Amino acid sequence: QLTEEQIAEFKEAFSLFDKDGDGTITTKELGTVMRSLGQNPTEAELQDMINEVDADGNGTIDFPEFLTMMARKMKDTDSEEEIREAFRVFDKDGNGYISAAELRHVMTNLGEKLTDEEVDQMIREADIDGDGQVNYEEFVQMMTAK
Amino acid sequence: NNLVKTEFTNETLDKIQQTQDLLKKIPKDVLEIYSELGGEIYFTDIDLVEHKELQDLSEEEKNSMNSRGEKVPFASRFVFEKKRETPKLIINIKDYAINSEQSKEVYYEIGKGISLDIISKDKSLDPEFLNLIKSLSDDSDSSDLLFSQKFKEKLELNNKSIDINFIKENLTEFQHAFSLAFSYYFAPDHRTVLELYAPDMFEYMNKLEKGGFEKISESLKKEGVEKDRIDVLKGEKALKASGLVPEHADAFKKIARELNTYILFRPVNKLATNLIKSGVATKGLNVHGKSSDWGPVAGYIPFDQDLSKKHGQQLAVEKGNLENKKSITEHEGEIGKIPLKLDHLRIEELKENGIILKGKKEIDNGKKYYLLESNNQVYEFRISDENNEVQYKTKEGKITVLGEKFNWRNIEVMAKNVEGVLKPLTADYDLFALAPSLTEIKKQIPQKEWDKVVNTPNSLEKQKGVTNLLIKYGIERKPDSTKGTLSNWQKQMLDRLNEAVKYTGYTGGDVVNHGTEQDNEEFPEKDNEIFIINPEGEFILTKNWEMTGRFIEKNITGKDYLYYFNRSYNKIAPGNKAYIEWTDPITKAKINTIPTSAEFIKNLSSIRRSSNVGVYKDSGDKDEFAKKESVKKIAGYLSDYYNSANHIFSQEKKRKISIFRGIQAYNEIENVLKSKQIAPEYKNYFQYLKERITNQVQLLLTHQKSNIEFKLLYKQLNFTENETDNFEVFQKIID
Ligand SMILES: [Ca+2]
Ligand SMILES: [Ca+2]
Ligand SMILES: [Ca+2]
Ligand SMILES: [Mg+2]
Numbered sequence: 001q002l003t004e005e006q007i008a009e010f011k012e013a014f015s016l017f018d019k020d021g022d023g024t025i026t027t028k029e030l031g032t033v034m035r036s037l038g039q040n041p042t043e044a045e046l047q048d049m050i051n052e053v054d055a056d057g058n059g060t061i062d063f064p065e066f067l068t069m070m071a072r073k074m075k076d077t078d079s080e081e082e083i084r085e086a087f088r089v090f091d092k093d094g095n096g097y098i099s100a101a102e103l104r105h106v107m108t109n110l111g112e113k114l115t116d117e118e119v120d121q122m123i124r125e126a127d128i129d130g131d132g133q134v135n136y137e138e139f140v141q142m143m144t145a146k
Numbered sequence: 147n148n149l150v151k152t153e154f155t156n157e158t159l160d161k162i163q164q165t166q167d168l169l170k171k172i173p174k175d176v177l178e179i180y181s182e183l184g185g186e187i188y189f190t191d192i193d194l195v196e197h198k199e200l201q202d203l204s205e206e207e208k209n210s211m212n213s214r215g216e217k218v219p220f221a222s223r224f225v226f227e228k229k230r231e232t233p234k235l236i237i238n239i240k241d242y243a244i245n246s247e248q249s250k251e252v253y254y255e256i257g258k259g260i261s262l263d264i265i266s267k268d269k270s271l272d273p274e275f276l277n278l279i280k281s282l283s284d285d286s287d288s289s290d291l292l293f294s295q296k297f298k299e300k301l302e303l304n305n306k307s308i309d310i311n312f313i314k315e316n317l318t319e320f321q322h323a324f325s326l327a328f329s330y331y332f333a334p335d336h337r338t339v340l341e342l343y344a345p346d347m348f349e350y351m352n353k354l355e356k357g358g359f360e361k362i363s364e365s366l367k368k369e370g371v372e373k374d375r376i377d378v379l380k381g382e383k384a385l386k387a388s389g390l391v392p393e394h395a396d397a398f399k400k401i402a403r404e405l406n407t408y409i410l411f412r413p414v415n416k417l418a419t420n421l422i423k424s425g426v427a428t429k430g431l432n433v434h435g436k437s438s439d440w441g442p443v444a445g446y447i448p449f450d451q452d453l454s455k456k457h458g459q460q461l462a463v464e465k466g467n468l469e470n471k472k473s474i475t476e477h478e479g480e481i482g483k484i485p486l487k488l489d490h491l492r493i494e495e496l497k498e499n500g501i502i503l504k505g506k507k508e509i510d511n512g513k514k515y516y517l518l519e520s521n522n523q524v525y526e527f528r529i530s531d532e533n534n535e536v537q538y539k540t541k542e543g544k545i546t547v548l549g550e551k552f553n554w555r556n557i558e559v560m561a562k563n564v565e566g567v568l569k570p571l572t573a574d575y576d577l578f579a580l581a582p583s584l585t586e587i588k589k590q591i592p593q594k595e596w597d598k599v600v601n602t603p604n605s606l607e608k609q610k611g612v613t614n615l616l617i618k619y620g621i622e623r624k625p626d627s628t629k630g631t632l633s634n635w636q637k638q639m640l641d642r643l644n645e646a647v648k649y650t651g652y653t654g655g656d657v658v659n660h661g662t663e664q665d666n667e668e669f670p671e672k673d674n675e676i677f678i679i680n681p682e683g684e685f686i687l688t689k690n691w692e693m694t695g696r697f698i699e700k701n702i703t704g705k706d707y708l709y710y711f712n713r714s715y716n717k718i719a720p721g722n723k724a725y726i727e728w729t730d731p732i733t734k735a736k737i738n739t740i741p742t743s744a745e746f747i748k749n750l751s752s753i754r755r756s757s758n759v760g761v762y763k764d765s766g767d768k769d770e771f772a773k774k775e776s777v778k779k780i781a782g783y784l785s786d787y788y789n790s791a792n793h794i795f796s797q798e799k800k801r802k803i804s805i806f807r808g809i810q811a812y813n814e815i816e817n818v819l820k821s822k823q824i825a826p827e828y829k830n831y832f833q834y835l836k837e838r839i840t841n842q843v844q845l846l847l848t849h850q851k852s853n854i855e856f857k858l859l860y861k862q863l864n865f866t867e868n869e870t871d872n873f874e875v876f877q878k879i880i881d
Contacts, residue, residue, distance in 0.1 A: 005755070012751035012760065013744070016778050021764070021771075036781055038744035082617040085710045088731060089584075089616070092704050096735025103609070109584040109706055110616060111596070118605050125606050128792040130800025131849050135739060136732045137788060143610055145790055 002070060013037050014066055024060045033066075040145075079144075087139050097133040099123070149181035153238075154191030164239055165189040168254060171332060175359035179262045182366045185233035195221055198236050205230035211318065214256060214326055215298070225257040233261040248335040255332055259325030266362060267354075268324045269317055281320055283346045284308045290345040296323040327351060376696055377689065384687035388677035389414030390575065391423045394647045394657065399683045401642055408581030408702055409643075410678040412663060412671075417445040418573035420495060427564050427654035428574030431630055432477045435470040435560055436462075437573060441520045442488060442527050442536050444501050447560035447571050449483040452546055453525065453538075460547045467548075470560055483558035484568045486536040488529060502527075528554070564655045575643075575658040578676050579698075580636055581707040587620035590635050620708055623665055632661025667714045668721035681707075695729055738841040740808050743785035749831060750777070757827050761818075769822050776818050783811035801846045806876055808846070812839040813865050851880050 002010070017032045018025050025033060031046050041049070049069050050061045061069070092102040104119040114122075126134045126142045134142070152165060169177070169187075180187065190198055205228070210218045228234035235258055244251045264270075268277045285291035285304055293301070300319035306312065313320065330340035331351035341348040354361075378384070385395050390411060402409055414422070417439055422428070426446075429437075435447040438454035448454050451466030459466075473481045488496075496502040503519040514531035524544040529536045540551045561568040588596075599611035625631040629640065644656040663670065676694045678686045680701070688694040702709045715728040741749075754760045762774035787807045792800050818824060819832045843856050862879055864872055 005751070008751035008755050009744075009748055012754055013747045016747065016774065016781065036743040036747060036785055038742060081713065082621050083613075084732070085621045086613045086617045088710070089621070089708060090613075091731055094699065094704060094729070094731045094734065096731040096733070106584065106706075107609070107612070109588070110612065111585075111588045112600055112612065121605050122609050124797075125793045126609070127797075128788055128790065128800065129804040129846060130792075130795075130797045130802075131846060132797060135735060137739060137742060141788060141790055142606065143613060 002067075002074060006070075006074075007067060009037065010067055010070055011063060014063060024056060024062045025066070027059055030061060030066070080140075083140060083143050084136065086143070087136050097135055098139060099133050103134075147181055149177060149185065150187045150189065152189045153193070156191050160242060161189075161191070161239055164242075164244070165237075168244075168251065171334060172255070172258070173332070173355055173359055175363050176262060176328075178363045179266070179359060179366065180233060180235075182363060182370060183233050183262070183265055184231075185235065185261065188234065188236040190236065190238045192240055193238055194224060200228065200234060201226070201236060204228065211322065213253060214322075214329075225253050227257060227260050229260070235261060245334060248333055252329045252333045252336075255329030256322075256325035259328045260321060262362075263321050263324040263328070264317070266324060267358070268320055270362065271365070273313055273317070273320070277320070277324075277350075278310065278313060280346060280350050281308055281313055283344075288345050292343050292345075295343055296326050323347075331355070376693055376700065378686045378693070378697065379689075380684050380686050382685070384677060385685040387413065387675055387687055388685065389416055389419050389573070390677060391419055393423065393650050394575075394652070395677075395679065395685060397646045397650050398643060398679055399685075401639070401646055402679050402681050403683060405639065405642075406583040406586050406681045407639065408579075408678060408681060408707060410578040410580070410676055412576045412578045412673045413675055413677070414575060415439070415445070415573045417496075417499075417501070420492070421445045421570075421572040422652075422654070422657065424489065424492065425569075425653045426572045427562055427569040428657050428659060429560070429571045430562060430574070430659040432481045432562065433470065433473045433560050433571060435473060436466055440501055441522055441525070442496065442502055442518050442529065442538075443486060443557055443559065444496060445572050446486060449558045449560060452548060453557070457522075458547055464548060473560065480563040482561060482568050484561045484570060486557040486559050486570070487534050488536060489534065493529075527557075562655075569654055576660070577640075577658060577662045578673070579662050579664050579709065580639055581698075581702045581709050582620075582635060582639070583681065583707045584616075585706075587616065587635070587708055591615055591619045616708075621710060623661070626661075630660035631665040631667075636661055664710060664712045667712060668719060670712050670714050670719050670722075670724065670726050672724075672726050691727075699729070737838070738845050740787050740811065740839050740842040741784055741835060742788060743781050746781055746784055746835070750828075753825075753827050753831065757825055759825050761824055761828050773818060773821055773824065776814055776821065780811055780814045780818075783807055783814065787811065798850065801850055802877070802880065805843045805846045805880075806873055808839055808843050809860070809863070809876075812836060812843070815839070847880075854880065 013036060014025065014033050017029050017036065019029075027046065027050065030050055031041070034041060049072060050059070050065075053061070053065055053069075056062065056065075087098070090098045090102055090106050092105060100119045100123040103122060104114050104116070107114050107119065123132070123134060126138055128138045128141065150165075150169065152162070155162070188198065188200065193199075193201070196202055207218070207220060210216065212218050224239065225237045226235070228236065237254060237257075267274060272278075273281070283290070284293060284297070284301065286307075291304070300316055300322070301308075327340065327344070327347045328351065330336055331348065340351070382392075385392060388395060388411065390398075398409060401407075415437060418426075418437070429435075429447060433447060435449075436451060436454040436456055438444050438446065438448055440457075441453065443453055447470070449467075449470050451463040451470070452458075454463075454466065456462040456466060470483070474483070493502070493504065497504060501520070504516060505519055506517055508515050508517055508528070515528040516531070518527040518529050518536070520527060524541055524546065525538045526541055527536060527538045536557045537554045538557055539554045540546055545551050559570045561570045596612075596615060599615055600608060602608045602611060620633070620635070623631055623633045623636070626637070629637060632640070640658055640661070643658045647657050648655075672691055674688075674690060676688045678688070678697070680686065686697070688697050698709065701707075711728050711730075712726070715726050716730055716733070718725050750761055761777055763770050787804060789807075792803065795803060815832050815835055819829070819836075824832075840856050843859075844852075847854060847856070847859075859876075859879060863876065
């Protein structure tokens with residue numbers, strides 16, 4: 001039972017990528033609506049959801065068919081927040097950013113031994129914009145992205 | 147806090163290779179005493195006179211007792227101490243020679259001396275017997291009445307014992323001494339002249355160098371923190387507003403230490419403090435009735451609501467009664483109402499408090515009733531003798547706001563089940579938060595799992611695997627039928643709290659019923675004062691929502707303890723529609739962060755549902771679709787920014803490839819912002835989304851080659867038809 005706000009989005013986004021403005025979105029189109037929404041299913045898991053309710057051009061989903069399928073993986077997952085609290089945890093200084101310093105720091109109190117090499121190694125791969133530090137955004141990415 | 151500032155690197159080495167020689171002389175500790183008294187030392191070029199950017203008129207020359215002996219011709223000086231708050235040693239040099247007649251560099255010592263000295267053992271702690279007696283070495287101790295060095299004028303007074311009688315008087319004279327004493331023990335020439343002419347002061351300075359300078363350099367470092375701190379009235383001075391019950395708090399004092407975790411409570415009402423020690427059980431979640439602060443009932447949840455704080459609130463009380471009723475209605479056998487029996491000690495308490503007045507007596511049906519008085523003007527109260535029950539009724543010339551009028555009835559209060567016995571209810575220990583140390587959470591994790599995670603190849607999945615572990619066993623909060631919403635450890639720690647207050651002597655059951663107000667996402671509340679019990683034992687009670695915030699930041703957050711704050715903070719919680727502010731870091735860095743595909747699309751859907759018009763309407767205006775198409779285009783650039791494949795690149799590139807992907811975005815934004823009449827609401831937003839991008843690209847710039855200001859780098863781009871070389875351009879533009 002997604003909140004209404006959990007709808008405006010799931011539509012204000014479902015439409016934006018509805019080129020041929022009818023009211024249904026193709027396959028690649030669903031794929032896109034989701035990614036943008038900060039998610040991203042697999043090249044093949046993209047079917048099972050839509051691939052299950054074929055009563056359209058056998059490959060197209062309406063607004064409903066969508067606003068509905070949004071509990072197959074939504075009415076469940078409440079992880080977004082834990083992950084943002086995990087973030088505030090490493091960010092040991094209140095700069096909104098996480099640094100190899102604090103990563104390695106907290107990485108040890110939790111009992112893990114990381115080499116100065118392999119920490120500057122995490123930060124890096126976690127960094128997308130090159131500023132040498134991980135922000136919530138990229139953090140959220142690292143975590144969720146499987 | 148760099149103590150020595152060298153103004154002019156003018157000359158070659160000589161000036162430098164000289165100031166150093168001066169400092170490497172003075173003891174690395176005497177300095178730290180300086181860099182503690184907030185001092186700074188200044189080596190300027192030839193600013194001799196009142197030219198030092200720090201030598202003008204502040205607290206200069208008032209009374210003349212300057213150099214070794216005396217002279218006071220300021221203008222002819224090269225060394226000086228800005229006497230008044232922080233010490234400021236300002237000094238300069240011209241050419242080479244200092245050693246020849248060190249009579250010069252000796253002033254850099256006394257001239258200094260007047261710095262630490264008066265705040266040194268001579269008087270800071272007071273002229274402690276140590277220097278109070280070294281002072282005595284005038285002529286009483288050793289056969290060395292040889293002090294014709296520092297006691298010429300101010301102390302040729304051999305005929306006046308020098309102990310306490312008069313040392314206070316001229317504290318400054320005994321400065322002119324610790325000075326030349328210091329100057330002589332460290333001067334580069336005369337070291338023994340203070341080992342001969344003075345038999346003890348040598349030992350004094352020596353003992354000082356021994357470790358005596360490390361002394362005050364620690365009784366200051368310590369008062370360095372303990373001084374400028376966060377006002378918090380610790381000790382039983384706090385445990386007094388805590389409301390908590392001392393045997394309990396003190397009891398808790400054991401758990402904090404064992405599990406190393408801060409404990410914070412909101413305020414437990416005073417008019418319940420004792421009812422708690424008394425053994426009255428506490429209000430859980432089942433009861434949503436209002437307590438009371440007056441009359442005989444005070445501290446109890448009067449089944450009757452027009453007998454609790456909200457006296458008169460015809461509807462609060464109205465709905466109030468309706469609340470206890472269901473409390474029972476629904477949860478029965480556990481929640482009900484029993485008669486108010488004010489035991490012994492209690493009565494004397496509501497007495498010296500002014501809540502009740504015990505006076506005249508009376509008879510009725512055969513039993514004694516001391517009549518209990520209270521300035522309430524509609525209800526009257528009397529307390530039985532046989533059993534100390536209590537009763538009230540509407541005065542013969544008044545009514546109940548709800549519209550009731552009744553004669554003597556007993557006062558029932560809410561009471562929960564407790565080992566099969568409806569015990570009365572009073573305030574509970576509502577934890578404000580629990581701060582277990584991160585190390586304590588690792589203990590929470592089951593060795594096998596953690597192992598199975600760290601014994602991985604992916605340096606990055608490892609971190610992920612870990613964070614989830616730290617999330618799973620430490621940050622996650624599931625709801626419970628019984629204890630509200632709370633973590634699992636939060637619960638273990640929850641029982642250990644109660645057990646602790648029961649292996650003492652509590653018989654009311656549990657004193658901490660639910661989880662931490664940090665999960666009271668629905669009806670969060672703001673309490674000024676918050677009682678906190680540190681991991682070691684000290685009791686503390688902040689005073690402001692901020693101080694609390696400020697405390698938690700210093701002692702909890704940025705100090706290795708896992709803490710999380712009420713999700714409904716900075717937002718508008720539903721239940722009571724209250725906005726409660728708390729410093730959120732992530733937000734402190736939004737001002738400089740390009741948004742996200744979805745973070746963007748979100749803010750649209752937002753405005754949509756308000757001014758009911760979207761950035762693009764469902765129409766045929768090929769100009770509208772122009773807009774639709776165009777946002778879809780921003781929601782791409784932005785989406786392209788945060789591409790995880792950015793790793794197969796290298797820091798330098800990332801910064802670039804991003805500043806561009808970024809710019810791309812900022813552009814189509816400029817585009818729509820100049821497109822057709824997008825509601826003035828979106829106008830602003832976009833105007834906001836711009837500053838972001840901007841701030842974000844400046845950032846990514848100042849990390850590498852930064853002279854180029856975003857505004858300027860922009861001009862140089864050609865976002866007309868071709869996009870190709872544009873980037874190749876951009877490249878060169880940043881080299
Ligand atoms: Ca379509
Ligand atoms: Ca940080
Ligand atoms: Ca970064
Ligand atoms: Mg409570």
